[PDB]
Symmetry: C4
Subunit: 284 residues, 4 copies
């Protein structure tokens, strides 16, 4: 059989990487490549945020700050000394770093407890119109349970797996059709990166359909890694949803390549491959 | 010359082709199992760190480590994929054990009262669908306490010879094929009896591993094996062939590394799992 | 087209052949200098960790890091060669500074009272034979306080443009070759004025670096440079050519890595130092 | 010019590696490869003991335990999870591990303070005739200042650089002649590994003269690394001074090889090369 494609949907290929990944201007400094703040990693799940951090740094973000439990700062710096670190208890400093951010990612390893809830509320309250805000993992669950309302939804990006999306959209998985998914995207006014074997991105335009991904990537940290890549991309590249699609595509391209040799693809190997892959596509 | 026993089954690469399946296209991480690894007191925390690296690299979908909070930092520096729970975190520890598909207890665990209490809790809650691997000092604790098995057929012990002597009451001299088999039967569990040619006793005919080398005779080799067994049970068919494939792969990689390496660092075996498993994955 | 200034000297590989000497057969580690690196508060500890890796890989004989005790663990995980002293350890800190051949203060240092007190102590004790490199926030602190230089000719400042504006009082618009040179003269120190083409102002004719690329425009690149400068001054002739060679090598490695790497991790530059330096070592 | 050699002195070559590094018997277990205890690393100098630990593990020691400040246990396990760890405060446990050891190394990063002094005295008091005891670095200085006397000197190995040897032997560097060095070795009844550009080993037999070493190795940690190799060798191989000479030779062979490509030879690179080098010489 030949493939079947849905009309009104953009199927992703290397084309998206050529479009999104631009050659850096010779007059650039690190501030031109964005300030990212990554928020997550409670005391049980600190490795999640460490994996997002490695992805963000390796994707080319200019400056990366991590708000995470102080417990996690040691191993984070052992792996990623490029990252700056702020503890959850550091109320004023964490507010300062969020205020300065170009991109905020909240959710990897964040958990569901009262501290997690408080930090999410502070971030949602503090969010500025021009800042990208990526809500991932347990932050989606808390968002849906806290009956919040988004002030500036147009630069919010949710990255749910199917059960997180059920919770956010109230669409049972059986009802998560292209039409229904799009309608529920429209109701939020935000971008939905609906993760699956073939991730789909819903937004104000024609949806993007990812064409990669493999079950060798079905391991803890793959999603944390993707979230970090998305954040690093939004930090550096044009503020359009194509940039998010480029991140999603590159994540699965690298993972698909690694799976050719690796039965399970360690998520940190995708991050470590970013600089060489991005160089190959950088639009000259 | 070799002495062969007619009832004995000799492992080869065939076991890997049988056990290691191609993953289905529609799989998600929960399909490849939730593993809980329990061990690593304040002296021996490296042991659980080595088991964890083996488990993650073997392809387990999710890995949580219950170990002294002292060890959480170095563990995450090496293995950020792992989730971590301290020995003091009683409610959380209980929850993660309850949710696990495979529980490994023992690497670096030591012999203290906290170790006995967690073993007690794990054994009390053991569910029929869960695999429980009891390794190292946890075997000593099990044998010395009045601990019993509700579902022995889902329990795997991984003793060295002195641990088997404690568990089976067979002195090393008396550890013959027939006597070993008889004491397995009495337990109703799988016994991975570690030696130069590790032998696996179970309800069927015993398996003997044909590999292994003294370049692997270094601290951590057994902790590594235990993590591979855990990861294999998390992903593959619930049969003793799955356990045999873990044992065989561990020594295959070790034997290959020993061709170039005088001593084989146990973490190198773990690091080679993804490439070896791809090679043998039943296509 | 390029604009050339007749008084300006353009760096090339010749500077490396001049600076990087073959080590004498009878050398010991103290011959390659004692470096003290001072920085890394609780938010920015990675910065001092990156300077330390650069310093060690550059060939400094002994490296001690004065940084918050929070940072000592990850630093040793990455750089076990480094010795570590906390900010609170006042007698020991004073001793290591006294014994140093080269002192670098600033990477990740922040602006708090402890940072001001240590800067004060370093400046007060500065010995004529010691090199002192003042980097990052330490430049801000120096300029805002009533700090002065007893031996300015052994002091190197490494400002970005806004730090130079604070130190020299020249707004960016006014930062011309002539004005920059005049404010160097007023200080009597070496100014490594970081930009796309870093320019070094000193008592002689200025040097301009000819390399550098936006793949290096990431957090840590400057912390790395500062460690290379420190290591070079610890080992090589006490002249401004030594500083120029550090600047040039840093960007040579970065420019080479950028051929394959979209962003150049600063730690990769550090890791490449031993192989690059061997290649250029004046035979 | 052709070389000049001293009569009554064995000049080392790969021959020593073939002699010392034996093929392991197929019936071996980890206990056959010795229990080593490494003691050092105060709060300032913890990296020293971490470097000795990596050398010891990579050299093939069966089991390695480190008695070091608890501060150091995290980074030690991040690099060397094979090692077991005991804090200086753990009086009973540290005594237990020393009692069981086949080889004790004391001194890398140990420092000179009261805790260092106490631990050295405990170890010297506890030493058993059959145990190898390597006294390195600041432990040599403390040994010389504490006017100690060795109970079983024949299995003590001192590893001084020239100024440490001046302190131990009272020979000014000018007076450190072959004859004088040997006489002062004889007075102690111990092995002296007198480290230099061309390390010399004095003992009850003809001295060994190392023929390698280079100034690319003149960096902090080189000596800590050597001490760990010596300890791992004594753990596994025949209890003769040739074993110590083999360790010293291999350390400089690897360092000399690495210096061909590396301006400075990171000491941890020597350790990481041990398994491949030892395989090449293992006497079949
Ligand atoms: Cl985690
Ligand atoms: Cl994930
Ligand atoms: Cl404990
Ligand atoms: Cl601070
Ligand atoms: Cl150290
Ligand atoms: Cl040393
Ligand atoms: Mg702003
Ligand atoms: Mg359940
Ligand atoms: Mg002095
Ligand atoms: Mg004994």
């Amino acid at each position: 059989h030949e493939n079947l494609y849905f009309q009104g949907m953009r199927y992703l290929s290397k084309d998206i990487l050529e479009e999104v990944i631009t050659q850096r201007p010779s007059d650039s400094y690190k501030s031109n490549f964005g300030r990212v703040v990554l928020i997550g990693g409670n005391r049980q799940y600190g490795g999640a945020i460490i994996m997002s951090t490695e992805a963000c740094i390796n994707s080319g973000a200019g400056l990366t700050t991590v708000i995470t439990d102080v417990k996690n700062h040691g191993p984070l710096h052992a792996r990623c000394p490029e990252a700056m670190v702020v503890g959850f208890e550091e109320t004023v400093l964490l507010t300062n770093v969020v205020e300065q951010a170009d991109v905020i990612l909240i959710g990897p390893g964040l958990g569901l407890d009262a501290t997690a809830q408080q930090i999410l509320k502070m971030v949602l309250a503090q969010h500025q119109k021009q800042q990208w805000l990526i809500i991932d993992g347990s932050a989606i669950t808390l968002f849906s349970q806290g009956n919040f309302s988004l002030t500036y939804p147009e630069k919010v990006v949710f990255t749910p797996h199917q059960m997180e999306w059920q919770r956010l959209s109230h669409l049972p998985i059986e009802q998560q059709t292209l039409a229904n998914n799009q309608r529920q995207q429209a109701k939020l006014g935000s971008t939905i990166v609906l993760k699956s074997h073939r991730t789909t991105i819903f937004h104000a335009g024609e949806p993007f359909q990812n064409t990669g991904g493999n079950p060798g990537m079905a391991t803890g940290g793959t999603g944390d890694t993707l979230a970090g890549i998305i954040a690093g991309f939004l930090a550096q590249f044009k503020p359009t949803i194509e940039t998010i699609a480029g991140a999603v595509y590159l994540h699965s391209l690298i993972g698909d390549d690694l799976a050719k040799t690796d039965y399970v693809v360690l998520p940190t190997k995708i991050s470590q491959a970013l600089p060489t892959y991005m160089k190959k596509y950088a639009q000259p």
